[model samples]
Target: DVQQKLAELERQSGGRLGVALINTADNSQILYRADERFAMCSTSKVMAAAAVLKKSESEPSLLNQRVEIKKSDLVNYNPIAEKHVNGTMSLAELSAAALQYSDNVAMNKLIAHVGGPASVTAFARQLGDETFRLDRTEPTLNTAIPGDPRDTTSPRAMAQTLRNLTLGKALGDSQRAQLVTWMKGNTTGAASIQAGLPASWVVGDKTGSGGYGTTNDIAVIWPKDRAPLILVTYFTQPQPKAESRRDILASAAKIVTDGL
Candidate 1:
C-alpha cells in the first residue's frame, strides 16, 4: 500500500523528508507527520500568484502591467538563473519566470509589485491559512539572503490550497483558471510531480528550493480516467544527491494514481 511506501520513503529519507498526500476527490489525507511546518521558499509564490490573480480579476490591468528591474531586485541565491543583467519584464512575465525558471529576482519583483512581503501573508490569512506565513522578503543579513531565502509552510496547508484551486473553489472560477494556466506553463524543472507520470498525463505544478536546506512542490494531476488529485510534498535537509525533490514526490504520486 502507499502508506507503507511512504513509511519506507521516510525511513530512507534519513529523517529529512516530511510528506502529505490528499485525495481531492475523497477529501482523505495520507501523511507522515506532514502537518509539521517548514519554510515554503518559492512555493509561497503560488499563493501570492493566486492573490495577484484575485486582485487582477477586479483590475485586469495588473496582469498586463509592467515592472522595472533594478539592481536591488537582483537575487543571488538561485543556481539555475542569473541576475536580471538585461532589464525589466511585465507582471505576467515575472510570474512565468518565477514558476518556470524558479527565478528569485522575478519572484521578488512580483512580491514587490503585489505590495511587498505582507501581501502574500494577507492573502494566506484571507484564505484562513493557520499553518503558513510569509516570513521575510529582503534577504537576511545573517544568511545568504539573496540566494538562501526564508519562508515557511506546512504540507497540510499546501495540499489544501492546491485542492481549493483544483476545485475552482479558491478565489473563484476566473482566478483559479488563471492560476491553473500559469502553473501549466511552469518549466523550471521536470523532476518532481512531472517525474513518473505517463507522457500524456497533464500536471500543473510549482517547485521551491532554498540553500537553507529545503525543497518541495504542489501539484494537480489530471489523469484521463480518474478525477484530478492535488499532491503536496515537503522535504527538509535533503540529500545533495537528490537535487530535485520533485522527482521523489512525483514517483510517490504516480504510485497513488496507479492504485486509484
Candidate 2:
C-alpha cells in the first residue's frame, strides 16, 4: 500500500520526494522515507517556537514583553515592520508573525530575542534530535548571505517533534497549550497535511519552502476520537507544481489515517 502510494506521488511529482509518518501516540511506524536527514527549512520554526513558549511559561512576562525591530529585521515576508516608525512588537506578536507569514525576519527576530541560533539548536537536542542542526541562520527574502550551514533534520525527527507537541508532553501542559495556540494561528495556506483531513478536524502546523528544491509541511492532525497523528513530508528536486505536492501529501495522509 505504501509503495503504491509513493509511486503515484513520484510519478505526479516528476520524481523528487521524501516522506514519513509515525503514530506518535504509540510509536507505531508507517511509510517510506528518503534521506530521513533532509533539510527542514522554515519548518524548523516549530522547534524554535516551542522553545520560546517553554521559556515564556517560566516567565509569563516574556510573552507580553515588547521588543524593538531593527533595520536587520527588514527581510522578506515582514516588510511591513520596516515601515513602522517606532516599529516594535511583543514576543507573542513576533511569534504570530513568524508562523503566520513564514516571515524570515520575524523568525530571526524571535530566534535572536529568544537567545540566538544556539538556543534553538540546544532546545532541539533536548528533544532527542542529535541530527538536527541550526548551524546557520536562514536568510530573509532569499538574498541575504547564507548564515552558517542551512538548517536540516530528518522526516522522522520532524514527526517526532510534532507528536510531542500535540500530546502536551514536549513542554508540559501550560507550555504545550501556548505552543498549540501559536501553531493554530499559523497562517500558511492549507494544502498539504491540511488538505486531506475532514473540515472539522483541527491541524496545527508549519510549512517551509526554499530555493528550487524544497517544499514541505510538518503538522499534527487531530481527528475526533483517535490520537493525533504526526505527518511530515520533505521534498527536494522534481520541483512538482505546488498544487500537485499538496494533493500528494494530503492523499498520503488520508491513507495513513484510514489504515490506522
Candidate 3:
C-alpha cells in the first residue's frame, strides 16, 4: 500500500516527513503525517499572494499600481537585489517575482501592502480554511543563515489551500488560473518533486526552505495519463544537509506517482 511505502521512506529519510496526496478528479487521498505542522518557510508566500489577489479583485488598480522599492527594502541573497533597482515596481511585477522566483523583498512588499500576516490568515478563513495561519513576513533571512519560523502549515492544510483555488474560494477563476500559472513555472526546488516525476508530466507547485533544518514542497502534479493530484510534502531536520530533505520528498513523490 502507499502508506507502507511512505513509512519506509520516512524511516530512511530520518526526520519528520508529512505527505498529503489527493486525486484531483475525485478527492481520493493518501495521507502520511499529513496533520503534522511544518514551519512553511517561503511556501507561506503563496498564502500571502492569495490574500493580495482577493484585495486586487476589489481594487483592481492595485495590481498595476507602482510602489517604490528602496534599497533599504532589500534583504541578503535576494534574487531581485542585483537589479540595482531603487525605483518603483508594480504590484503585479512584485507578485510574479515573489511567486515564481521567491523574491523575499517582493514578498515583504506584498505583505505590507495588505496589512500583515494576520491579513493573509484572515483571507484563508474566508477561503474556508480557518486553521491555516501566516505569522511572519519576508526579509526573513539574517544573512546566509535561514531564520525563524515566519509561518507554518500542515500538509493537509496546504493541500486544501491549493484545492481552494480550484473551488473558486481562493480567487476568481481567471485570477486563480493566473496564480496557478505562476506556480507552474515556479523555479524553486528544482531537484525535488518534479525532478522525481516522469518528464512528460506537468507539475505546478510552491517550494519552501528555511533555517538550518527545513525543506518543503507543495504541488498539483499531473502524469501523462491521469488527472492531476495534489501532493504536499513537508520535511524538517534540526540540522539538515541541503539535499537530504529533498531526496526524501523525491522518494515520496515516486511512491505516490507509482500508485497512480
Candidate 4:
C-alpha cells in the first residue's frame, strides 16, 4: 500500500520521487527509487559540516581557526553568512551556519577549510557510502541541472551516511553529539517530512531545493514511543521544471509513518 501510494503520487506529479526509511532498531527499511541518483542540493550541507567536524577531531585547532568571509563569497539563500559579511568565523561557527541555516557561503567556506568538494565525498566514502559525492561549491552545486551527475546522491546513500555518522561509530561521541545538535537545530524543512509526522515526534533535518523541481529533506526522526528512524525524500520534475512540491513529499512521508 505504501509503495502503491507513493507510485501514484509520483505519477500525479509527473516527476520522480525517491524515499528511503530505515528503522534503526531492526535495520529494516522501506525504499523507493532509493538507489537512483538525484541532485543533493543543500542537503549536502550536512555532509560538509560532518567533514569539518571529522577533521577537527584530529586537528583540534581546526575548529577555532578563523576564516575570513568576504562579501563576494555570499550566495543567494545564505541568510546567516550574509549577516556576517567581511567578518571572520571559526570552522565551528561555519559548520553551524551550514547546518542550521543551509547557508551557501558557509558551505563553501567549510569546503575550502576541509580541503575541497572532494573531501566531502571522501568523508562519505569513509562512512561506506561510495555514491555520495560533492563536486562543486554552493550556488554552482545548487544549479541542479537535469541529468547532471555532479553533486548528486541516492536516497539510500543519504540515509546510510546519516545513520553511520549519527548512530554509528564513524564519529567520536562528542563529535557525533555535536552533529546531531546542529541538525536538530536546523530551521528548514518544516513543510516537508516534518509536516507529515505527528506533533509528538521530533526531527532534525536538512533541506535542499533547486532547479528542475528538486526538493529534498533528509532527517533523523524520533517517534515518541519507539526507536529513531532515518528518512530521506528527494523529488525532481522533468524538463518542464515544475516548482518543488513540499506537499507531495509530505504525503509520501505520511504514508510511510501511518503504515509503520
Candidate 5:
C-alpha cells in the first residue's frame, strides 16, 4: 500500500522525508510528514517566477528586455552555457532557462531581475500559513545572523502553492500557462520520479538538489489530459546515498501510482 511503503522508505532513508500527495482532480490528500520544512532548493524559484509574472503585468516590456550574462556569474551548473557562454538573453529566455534547465546562474540572476529575496519573501508571506522564507542565494549557504529559517518551506505549503498556480489562482492564465509550459519542458532530473511513472503520464516539474544527495522534486502529474495529482518528495540529508535517494523516489512514486 502507498502508506506502508512511504513509512518504510522514511524509516530506512537515514534522511528526512517530507512528501505531499494530492489528487489534483478531487483534492483528496495523503500527507507523510509533509509539514516539516527543509531547504527548498530550486523549488523556491517557482515563487520567483510567480512574482516576476505578476510584475510583468504592469511592465509588459519586462519579458522582451535583455540582460547581459557575465561568465563570472555562471557559478553553478547550467545547460544554457552549452552554445553560448557569455551573451545577452532576454529576461523571458533567462527565466525559461531557469525553469527548464534549473540553470543556477540564470535562476540567481532571474531572482535579482524580479527584485531579489525581499520581493520573493513578500510574495511568500502572502502565500499563507506554511509560506516560504527566503534569505540567501544559490552560492549562499548559511545565514550570517543564524537562528533563522534558511530558505525553508513546508512540502504541503509548496504543493498547495503549485495547485494554486495550476488552477489559475496564483497568476493570470497566460502566466500560469507559461510556468506550466516551462515545467513541462524541464530537462533536469531525468532519472527521478518522472521516469518512474507510466509512459502515458506527462510530468511538469522542478528539481532542487545539492551535492551529497540533498534532493527535492515538485511535480504536476497528468495521467491523461488533465492534472491528476501533484507529488512532492524531499530527501534532505547531508550524506544521503545518491542511489538510494533515486530508488526511493522511483519506488515511492510507484506506490502512489498503484494506489490510484
Candidate 6:
C-alpha cells in the first residue's frame, strides 16, 4: 500500500522519487525505487561529520583542535564558515554547523580534516555501506546534473549508512548522541519529512537541495509506542532547470508515515 501510494505521488509531482524505510525493532521495511542513485547534495555532510567523530575516538584531542579558514577556502552558501573565515573553529563546532545549518564551508573543512571526499566514502565503507560516494566539495556537489554519477547515493544505501552511524555501533555512545543532537536541531528540514509527520512524533534529519529539482530528507523517526524508523525520501524533477520541490518530498513522507 505504501509503495502504491508513493508511486502515485511521484507521478503527480512529475519527478523521480525514492523512499527507503526500516523499522529498527523488527527489520521490517518499505522500499520504493530505493536502489536507484540520486544526487546527495548537502545530505553528504552527515557522513563527513560521522567520519570526524570516528577519528576522534582514536585521537580524542582532535575534537578540540582548531582549524583556520581563509576567505579563499569558502564556497557558496557557507553562512557559518563565512563568519569564521580568517579566524578559527574547532572540529566539534564545524561538525555541529555542518549538520544543524548545512554549512557548506563546514562540510568542505571537515572533509579535508578527515582526508578528503574519497576519505568520507571510505568511512562509509567502514560503516558497512558500499554504494555511497562523495566525489566533490560543496557548490560543485550541488550541481546534481542529470544522470551524472558523481556525488550520488541510493536511498537504501543512505538509510543503511545512517542507521550504522547513528543507531548501530559505528560510533561511541556519546558520539552517536552528539550526532543525533545536531540532526534534531537542523534548521533546514522544516518543510521536508518532519513536516509530514504527526506533531507528536520525534524526528531528526539532514536535508539537501541541488540542481535538476533535487530535494531530499533522510531521518530517524520515533513514533509513540513504536520502534524508531529510518526514513529516506529523495525526489528530483527531470527538467534541467527545475527547482527542488519541498511539497513533493513532504507528500511522499506523509504517504509513507500514513501507511505505518
The C-alpha local distance difference test score for the whole of candidate 1 amounts to 0.68
**Mind giving the per-residue lDDT tens digits that candidate 5 earns over 1-260?**
66788888877876677788888677788788788766777877777777787778788888888777776777657678434566788878878887888777777777788678877888767755346777777656221121236787777888888888765477877888888888899887567778678888988888876544667788888886665798888766545344336666666677776766
Candidate 4 lands at a TM-score of 0.97
Q: Is candidate 2 or candidate 6 better by TM-score?
A: 6
* Sort by TM-score, top down from the best: 6, 4, 3, 5, 2, 1
Backbone clash total for model 3 is 0
Candidate maximizing lDDT: 6
Model 5 spans > 4 angstroms off: 81-86, 141-148, 225-227, 238-244
Off by over 4 Å in 1: 77-87, 138-150, 238-247
Candidate 6 global lDDT: 0.89
- Residue pairs with colliding backbones in model 1 are 39-151, 39-152, 40-152, 77-147, 100-188, 191-247, 192-246, 192-247
**lDDT tens digits by residue: candidate 4, 87-119:** 888888988888988888889998988789998
Worst 10 residues of 5 by lDDT: 139-148
Per-candidate TM vs. native?
0.85, 0.86, 0.91, 0.97, 0.89, 0.97
lDDT of each: 0.68, 0.70, 0.76, 0.88, 0.74, 0.89
Q: On residues 1-260, what C-alpha lDDT tens digit does candidate 1 reach at each position?
A: 87788767767655355566676577777766577776676777787677777778788688788677666566665432354445557777777777677777766766776787778778777777766677666343112122233466678887877777656576768777777887888885478767767777788888876643456778887877777777787766534333445556666666656666
Residue pairs in clash, model 3: none
Please list the residue runs of candidate 6 whose C-alpha ends up more than 4 Å from where it truly belongs after superposition: none
- Writing each residue's lDDT as its tens digit, candidate 6 over 160-188 gives 88888778888999899989998988888
lDDT of 3 by residue, 213-244 (tens): 57778887767978778888888765644444
Output candidate 3 Cα RMSD: 2.8
Q: lDDT at 57 for candidate 6?
A: 85
Which pairs clash in model 4? none
